[PDB]
Amino acid sequence: QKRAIYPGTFDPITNGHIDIVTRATQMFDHVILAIAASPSKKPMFTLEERVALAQQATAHLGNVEVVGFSDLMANFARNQHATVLIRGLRAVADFEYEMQLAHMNRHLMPELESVFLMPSKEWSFISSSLVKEVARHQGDVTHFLPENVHQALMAKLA
Amino acid sequence: KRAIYPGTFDPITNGHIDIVTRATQMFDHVILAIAASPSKKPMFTLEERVALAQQATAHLGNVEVVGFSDLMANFARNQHATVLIRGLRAVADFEYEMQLAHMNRHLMPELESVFLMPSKEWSFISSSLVKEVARHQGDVTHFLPENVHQALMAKLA
Amino acid sequence: QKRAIYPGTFDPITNGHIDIVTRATQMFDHVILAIAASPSKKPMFTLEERVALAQQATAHLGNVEVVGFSDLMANFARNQHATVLIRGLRAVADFEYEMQLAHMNRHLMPELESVFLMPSKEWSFISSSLVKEVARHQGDVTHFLPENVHQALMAKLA
Amino acid sequence: KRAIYPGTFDPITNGHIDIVTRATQMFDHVILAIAASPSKKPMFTLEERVALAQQATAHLGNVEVVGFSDLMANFARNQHATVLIRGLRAVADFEYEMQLAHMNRHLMPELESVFLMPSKEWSFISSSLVKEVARHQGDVTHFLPENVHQALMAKLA
Amino acid sequence: KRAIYPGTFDPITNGHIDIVTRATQMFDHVILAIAASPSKKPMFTLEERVALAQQATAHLGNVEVVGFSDLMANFARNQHATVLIRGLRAVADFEYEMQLAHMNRHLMPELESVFLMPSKEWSFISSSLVKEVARHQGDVTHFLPENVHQALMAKLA
Amino acid sequence: QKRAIYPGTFDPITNGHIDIVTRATQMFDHVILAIAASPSKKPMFTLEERVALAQQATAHLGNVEVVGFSDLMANFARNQHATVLIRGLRAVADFEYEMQLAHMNRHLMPELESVFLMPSKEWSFISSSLVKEVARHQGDVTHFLPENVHQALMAKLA
Numbered sequence: 008q009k010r011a012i013y014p015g016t017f018d019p020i021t022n023g024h025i026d027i028v029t030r031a032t033q034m035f036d037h038v039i040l041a042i043a044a045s046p047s048k049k050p051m052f053t054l055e056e057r058v059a060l061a062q063q064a065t066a067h068l069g070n071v072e073v074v075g076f077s078d079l080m081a082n083f084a085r086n087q088h089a090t091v092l093i094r095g096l097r098a099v100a101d102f103e104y105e106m107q108l109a110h111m112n113r114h115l116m117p118e119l120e121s122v123f124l125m126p127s128k129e130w131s132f133i134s135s136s137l138v139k140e141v142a143r144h145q146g147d148v149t150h151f152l153p154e155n156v157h158q159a160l161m162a163k164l165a
Numbered sequence: 166k167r168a169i170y171p172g173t174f175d176p177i178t179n180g181h182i183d184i185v186t187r188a189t190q191m192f193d194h195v196i197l198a199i200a201a202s203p204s205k206k207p208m209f210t211l212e213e214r215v216a217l218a219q220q221a222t223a224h225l226g227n228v229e230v231v232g233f234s235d236l237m238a239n240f241a242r243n244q245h246a247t248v249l250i251r252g253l254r255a256v257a258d259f260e261y262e263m264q265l266a267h268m269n270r271h272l273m274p275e276l277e278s279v280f281l282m283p284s285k286e287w288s289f290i291s292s293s294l295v296k297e298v299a300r301h302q303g304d305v306t307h308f309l310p311e312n313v314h315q316a317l318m319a320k321l322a
Numbered sequence: 323q324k325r326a327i328y329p330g331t332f333d334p335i336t337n338g339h340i341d342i343v344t345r346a347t348q349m350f351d352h353v354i355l356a357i358a359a360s361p362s363k364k365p366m367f368t369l370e371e372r373v374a375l376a377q378q379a380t381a382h383l384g385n386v387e388v389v390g391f392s393d394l395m396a397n398f399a400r401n402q403h404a405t406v407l408i409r410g411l412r413a414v415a416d417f418e419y420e421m422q423l424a425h426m427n428r429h430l431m432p433e434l435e436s437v438f439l440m441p442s443k444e445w446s447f448i449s450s451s452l453v454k455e456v457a458r459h460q461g462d463v464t465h466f467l468p469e470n471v472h473q474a475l476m477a478k479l480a
Numbered sequence: 481k482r483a484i485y486p487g488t489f490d491p492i493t494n495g496h497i498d499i500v501t502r503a504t505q506m507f508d509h510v511i512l513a514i515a516a517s518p519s520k521k522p523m524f525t526l527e528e529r530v531a532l533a534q535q536a537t538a539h540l541g542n543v544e545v546v547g548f549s550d551l552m553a554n555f556a557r558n559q560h561a562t563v564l565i566r567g568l569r570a571v572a573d574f575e576y577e578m579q580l581a582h583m584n585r586h587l588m589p590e591l592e593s594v595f596l597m598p599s600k601e602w603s604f605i606s607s608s609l610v611k612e613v614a615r616h617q618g619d620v621t622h623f624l625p626e627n628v629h630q631a632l633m634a635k636l637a
Numbered sequence: 638k639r640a641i642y643p644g645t646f647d648p649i650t651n652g653h654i655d656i657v658t659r660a661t662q663m664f665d666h667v668i669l670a671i672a673a674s675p676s677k678k679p680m681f682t683l684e685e686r687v688a689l690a691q692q693a694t695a696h697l698g699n700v701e702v703v704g705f706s707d708l709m710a711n712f713a714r715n716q717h718a719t720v721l722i723r724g725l726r727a728v729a730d731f732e733y734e735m736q737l738a739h740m741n742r743h744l745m746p747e748l749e750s751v752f753l754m755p756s757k758e759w760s761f762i763s764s765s766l767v768k769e770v771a772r773h774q775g776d777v778t779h780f781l782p783e784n785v786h787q788a789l790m791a792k793l794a
Numbered sequence: 795q796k797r798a799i800y801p802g803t804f805d806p807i808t809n810g811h812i813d814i815v816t817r818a819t820q821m822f823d824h825v826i827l828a829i830a831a832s833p834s835k836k837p838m839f840t841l842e843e844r845v846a847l848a849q850q851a852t853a854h855l856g857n858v859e860v861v862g863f864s865d866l867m868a869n870f871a872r873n874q875h876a877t878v879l880i881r882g883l884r885a886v887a888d889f890e891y892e893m894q895l896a897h898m899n900r901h902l903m904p905e906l907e908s909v910f911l912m913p914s915k916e917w918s919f920i921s922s923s924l925v926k927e928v929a930r931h932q933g934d935v936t937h938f939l940p941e942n943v944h945q946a947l948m949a950k951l952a
């Protein structure tokens with residue numbers, strides 16, 4: 008019954024994202040891991056690559072459905088009949104930004120309830136942004152990524 | 166799916182009602198659990214707070230109000246809850262919530278903390294603020310359930 | 323006597339800005355709503371459009387004067403003989419950024435006193451930035467904008 | 481244009497003087513209002529705090545020091561104030577200020593809260609910090625008006 | 638190079654051990670200084686806290702545990718320390734630390750405050766949190782040195 | 795014995811940076827003021843200029859060594875045998891960002907200990923970013939810069 012959506016750019020998907028989506032699947036019947044098709048800034052990985060990586064990294068998770076979407080997240084959520092909006096809150100999260108976002112999304116689709124989940128301490132201080140930047144500059148980020156993502160990232164930067 | 170929404174609720178305000186209502190639309194059963202919290206010298210006794218919360222949530226079918234004095238995590242496990250509801254206001258209280266969340270996770274890893282956001286209308290209120298205003302005879306009718314406002318007025322009369 | 327300046331990019335002006343400038347006109351004799359001519363990033367609306375929209379949205383406000391300015395805000399403030407600097411503080415404001423800004427502006431023009439006003443709860447969680455982005459991506463933002471701004475925004479995005 | 485600058489001022493520090501001075505350059509009349517705040521067990525009695533503040537602001541012509549024990553908003557309305565002055569330090573206290581501001585706005589919508597920023601010199605001080613240092617005989621001369629420093633030394637002698 | 642790591646340490650936790658260990662790898666000698674802090678009504682007496690800290694840091698060769706009741710800055714000067722160690726958790730406590738740091742700098746400008754960051758494992762714990770959990774018989778073995786856990790259990794038995 | 799590294803873009807070096815590096819030299823034997831060679835966004839001053847300005851501004855400081863570096867800071871730190879990483883924490887610092895950074899750097903090089911120092915109240919509210927922007931827009935920033943930097947900045951903007 009309960010359909011939740013966990014949207015983001017997932018460029019690329021990290022262990023932190025896997026942590027959050029796993030917790031979400033434990034409390035909700037169906038979870039749609041929604042990948043933004045055209046983010047403001049050109050992503051490192053194409054939508055096709057991001058969807059493929061996300062699908063493989065969540066293949067073990069039954070009620071998780073990876074899908075790409077363009078335009079407004081809220082519009083996609085409504086057409087997908089989602090009533091729960093999953094947001095991951097790391098310890099280094101811009102909380103005020105999350106409040107802005109949740110209130111705008113509530114204005115757009117009040118039937119979509121924002122719920123914030125907390126990752127393990129292990130992934131509470133890292134972001135996809137930092138991971139990409141360290142990787143681009145010759146730093147080891149293997150620890151923060153699913154094996155399939157790690158391999159794809161090495162190919163991408165080579 | 167059973168969730169527990171713990172707190173001091175001294176007293177339960179419209180903000181708490183907002184959060185628990187959102188919780189009921191998301192989970193099958195919601196246990197509003199009131200901690201004795203003797204160290205906080207609550208204005209209302211646990212018995213009074215439970216009664217107030219019960220009446221204030223009488224219209225919510227899947228809400229159960231209970232009081233407890235033990236470790237919240239043990240009470241949660243004993244109530245068969247797997248979701249722990251917390252409300253996050255327009256304040257940077259987020260820091261304290263993470264400490265509590267991680268401690269509870271250490272005590273009961275299967276109890277998943279979930280944070281809900283209240284409406285803009287109740288984003289700046291707290292039981293403490295309402296009590297302070299009422300102690301100085303200010304009008305707090307707007308922030309409390311009718312039965313709770315009556316109880317607060319009488320308590321300070 | 324008391325001349326205040328309420329500067330910004332106002333791209334476009336929103337109900338939150340109207341809320342703040344209205345509160346300012348209630349405590350100060352004359353309020354100059356100053357619109358930055360050339361913001362770092364290309365604005366959605368041209369200075370001409372932004373000034374026109376702001377003028378119409380504040381026409382009902384007597385002691386409000388809409389004016390465009392280039393270069394340093396402090397230099398404009400000084401030449402305009404303003405002694406009060408209005409800053410709106412939303413609940414989702416980057417407070418540390420506001421402190422940086424106020425201290426720099428104080429260094430530049432100590433005779434200009436920064437004063438922070440708080441908008442109603444209704445407009446405390448939205449920014450012009452979020453509004454534009456939601457609008458650009460097919461979301462309903464009518465609620466946050468004066469009617470004239472709403473009409474101009476639809477034309478702009480069409 | 482009458483403004484009210486409320487607070488516990490226990491004791492009034494150079495930081496408070498900085499804020500009230502900025503207020504006087506902006507508004508015609510400023511009422512520095514000291515709350516009894518019995519629940520905070522102030523170091524100085526309300527009478528002492530008023531006297532200290534009076535002397536400390538004697539040089540400021542448009543400042544009036546008064547004490548009060550009622551609801552701040554009612555006192556403000558009764559003082560004919562339409563501006564409520566609050567100081568914001570280099571701390572994220574901003575959150576608490578919004579709660580207070582919105583409650584006061586609910587109690588008296590025409591009382592407009594305005595936040596002023598102190599100089600860098602006083603951006604990290606508080607009455608609480610000064611008292612803690614003085615309780616351990618540390619030199620706090622730099623942070624307090626001459627009359628206040630004298631009173632604090634004598635109070636702890 | 639002598640550093641002082643002051644605190645209430647009521648009780649010293651694995652988080653404190655993490656911070657003091659990082660300090661010893663950076664400076665020649667580290668003085669773990671425990672403040673009497675009577676105003677905080679500590680669970681353990683200063684004597685008990687010193688003993689607990691001593692045992693908990695026995696393996697750290699360049700750490701010296703001492704208690705004090707005077708102004709921290711004077712104690713630091715009297716201990717010949719020129720570095721003041723403070724731990725910063727995953728919380729926005731940073732604000733309070735700046736106030737303390739600037740006051741101590743005013744009292745003793747040559748005492749340089751330095752902030753260290755604990756491991757992720759101890760980034761959300763505090764003495765207060767551990768005591769609260771233990772008061773409700775929750776398992777806090779994971780967060781405390783063996784000797785400290787024993788003392789806490791006995792203290793609450 | 796103790797070798798510390800104080801990395802940044804220093805574009806340009808300011809009195810706030812001088813404050814922090816001076817405090818660092820007082821507690822550590824040798825301090826390497828490391829200047830990032832190619833920051834994401836094109837710096838105002840070239841690496842050559844930034845190194846020259848930094849060297850002159852710290853010439854009076856004995857145990858300070860100004861050096862440029864490219865790629866990962868952690869990789870440079872390791873090859874330079876640094877065991878202490880100096881970070882300046884202003885009152886207007888994005889603390890959560892600093893935590894993200896310190897944990898990533900710890901992951902990369904655990905033997906490098908992050909230490910945060912606090913500048914004087916005088917430089918606690920200003921950033922290189924704000925200084926450059928005010929200067930670019932005709933504002934007086936002489937107060938925040940060493941004399942040599944001030945002169946170079948005027949030439950740069952002329």
Ligand SMILES: CC(C)(COP(=O)(O)OP(=O)(O)OC[C@H]1O[C@@H](n2cnc3c(N)ncnc32)[C@H](O)[C@@H]1OP(=O)(O)O)[C@@H](O)C(=O)NCCC(=O)NCCS
Nearest residue numbers: 014015016017043077078079080081099100101104105459
């Ligand atoms: C689509 C969506 C779910 C994607 O989520 P996302 O990957 O987290 O995207 P974000 O842009 O927020 O990036 C995340 C991080 O970027 C940073 N960030 C992004 N915009 C920021 C801003 N304006 N200020 C500060 N930080 C910002 C933050 O650090 C943030 O993480 P945090 O809150 O935990 O600290 C989210 O953008 C959304 O719900 N957008 C609303 C409007 C919309 O529908 N998108 C446009 C349609 S194409």
Ligand SMILES: CC(C)(COP(=O)(O)OP(=O)(O)OC[C@H]1O[C@@H](n2cnc3c(N)ncnc32)[C@H](O)[C@@H]1OP(=O)(O)O)[C@@H](O)C(=O)NCCC(=O)NCCS
Nearest residue numbers: 329330331332358392393394395396414415416419420931
């Ligand atoms: C001119 C001025 C009044 C315009 O105000 P403005 O529209 O609010 O412009 P800002 O760039 O601050 O944009 C506002 C929001 O952008 C964001 N922002 C801008 N720069 C940011 C930064 N460096 N870090 C984080 N957020 C930033 C913040 O979220 C901010 O809002 P908030 O503090 O409430 O959370 C202001 O820029 C100013 O006083 N500038 C000082 C220097 C100057 O004179 N301008 C240059 C002359 S051309």
Ligand SMILES: CC(C)(COP(=O)(O)OP(=O)(O)OC[C@H]1O[C@@H](n2cnc3c(N)ncnc32)[C@H](O)[C@@H]1OP(=O)(O)O)[C@@H](O)C(=O)NCCC(=O)NCCS
Nearest residue numbers: 144801802803804830864865866867868886887888891892
């Ligand atoms: C190299 C390094 C030491 C330079 O330091 P730096 O000059 O301070 O660079 P930053 O990008 O952090 O710029 C500083 C300010 O920019 C702002 N900033 C930068 N990235 C930001 C982000 N993602 N979100 C918000 N603010 C950000 C912050 O305000 C910050 O200051 P603050 O924390 O006190 O408030 C630092 O970038 C580092 O340690 N990077 C890790 C990865 C690396 O090795 N660099 C890539 C190799 S080329």
Ligand SMILES: CC(C)(COP(=O)(O)O)[C@@H](O)C(=O)NCCC(=O)NCCS
Nearest residue numbers: 171172173200236237238265268770773
């Ligand atoms: C009551 C509460 C949920 C805090 O909520 P509050 O801030 O709404 O009063 C918390 O103090 C609690 O869980 N108390 C029970 C005792 C306990 O288990 N404490 C450890 C919590 S980690």
Ligand SMILES: CC(C)(COP(=O)(O)O)[C@@H](O)C(=O)NCCC(=O)NCCS
Nearest residue numbers: 298301486487488515551552553580583
């Ligand atoms: C005194 C003060 C302004 C707080 O200021 P303080 O932090 O400087 O002590 C506030 O506690 C107050 O207004 N007290 C009077 C009683 C009251 O009306 N309280 C409700 C405030 S919303």
Ligand SMILES: CC(C)(COP(=O)(O)O)[C@@H](O)C(=O)NCCC(=O)NCCS
Nearest residue numbers: 613616643644645672708709710737740
């Ligand atoms: C003990 C401590 C370092 C605070 O640490 P804590 O938060 O770990 O208890 C501080 O309260 C202190 O320095 N106490 C001694 C008395 C004193 O000098 N106070 C003024 C500090 S500026």
